[PDB]
Write an enzyme that holds these catalytic residues in place. Structure first.
Site, PDB file in Angstrom:
ATOM      1  CB  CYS A 192     -23.668 -78.710   1.952  1.00 29.67           C
ATOM      2  SG  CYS A 192     -23.059 -79.943   3.118  1.00 29.67           S
TER       3      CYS A 192
ATOM      4  CG  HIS B  44     -22.196 -83.759   2.348  1.00 27.07           C
ATOM      5  ND1 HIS B  44     -21.097 -83.129   2.907  1.00 27.07           N
ATOM      6  CD2 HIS B  44     -22.174 -85.021   2.834  1.00 27.07           C
ATOM      7  CE1 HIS B  44     -20.448 -83.969   3.674  1.00 27.07           C
ATOM      8  NE2 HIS B  44     -21.084 -85.138   3.650  1.00 27.07           N
TER       9      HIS B  44
END
Lengths: 187, 187
Positions: free
Chosen positions: B105, B125
């Site tokens: 992420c 992400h």
């Protein structure tokens, strides 16, 4: 007002099945209370992850009604949930206030132990099916997530996000659910 | 001898991205040590879940080299990791000894901050893409899980299982990864 969720954390609970619903519900704006079955002390989960509950179940119960009571899985966690008289009372109450009850993986077996929602269509982890269906008190489902009335069940760690988003949708609607889902980068 | 994994847990870390890899790696028989960046005390995650680390990063560092150093996401969490000289040292030394480094992420931005794995193909992400590519020190990827040599990255909460299984496969092989995946009830 904000919708409220009670997540009962018992020793041996599956940490992924506990954290994913808590996190996703909180992203949806739901007020989640992680209640420790045994008390306020940190709880060691199925794979040794230690989580500090927001409150003891004892204190959490006496804190107004909840829109949903969540029961994570975990073989020992579900066992503990199933033997608890406190949980029995809580689930019985939820049934009578017509409140949502969500259980995942081995968690649904607690519903059987406390005779909750008999006659409902439910699913569980494959390894918990025979236990859950002993006595034929339910109709089994193969769906990754199954919702029959106020009884919402799911299959395992891998269906945790689906399980959580289903709870969100049932409490806050399809729009809120879609908004929370987008940033997760799910399949 | 079981492989070893170091998971650095900082305040603000995404709890799902922390618990899923820890749980899954432990299922694979990997000895995982959840090390608190700030010490041994409980860590408040991005959605207020409180996790108790197994040890402080200070103590964990002393415990032999790790086969993998894992960096969870979470905006504040990744920022704390990125501003830590302790993390810089751990990452630099892991890279130098040809040890796997895995980040998910927002976690990969800690790699940029500490100038780790420059030139590697990486993913993050979508919301951390610009930050990660500032300076063009990597090649970006949209693969849910990206593994370029000893730099393994992933995209978000929804890719956490894939991320964890990728780590398991890199450390213990495809068979162990498959055996761990089966009971999860994933896609």
């Amino acid at each position: 007002a904000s919708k409220r969720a009670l997540v009962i954390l018992a020793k041996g609970a599956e940490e992924m099945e506990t954290v994913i619903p808590v996190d996703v519900m909180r992203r949806a704006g739901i007020k989640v209370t992680v209640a420790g079955l045994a008390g306020k002390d940190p709880v060691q989960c199925s794979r040794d992850v230690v989580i500090c509950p927001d409150a003891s179940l004892e204190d959490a119960k006496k804190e107004g009604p909840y829109d949903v009571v969540v029961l994570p899985g975990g073989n020992l966690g579900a066992q503990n949930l199933s033997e608890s008289a406190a949980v029995k009372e809580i689930l019985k109450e939820q049934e009578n206030r017509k409140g949502l009850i969500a259980a995942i993986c081995a968690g649904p077996t607690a519903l059987l132990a406390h005779e909750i929602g008999f006659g409902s269509k439910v699913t569980t982890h494959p390894l918990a099916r025979d236990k859950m269906m002993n006595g034929g008190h339910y109709t089994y489902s193969e769906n990754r997530v199954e919702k029959d009335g106020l009884i919402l069940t799911s299959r395992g760690p891998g269906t945790s996000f689906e399980f959580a988003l289903a709870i969100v949708e049932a409490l806050n609607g399809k729009e809120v659910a879609a908004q929370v889902k987008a940033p997760l980068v799910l399949k």
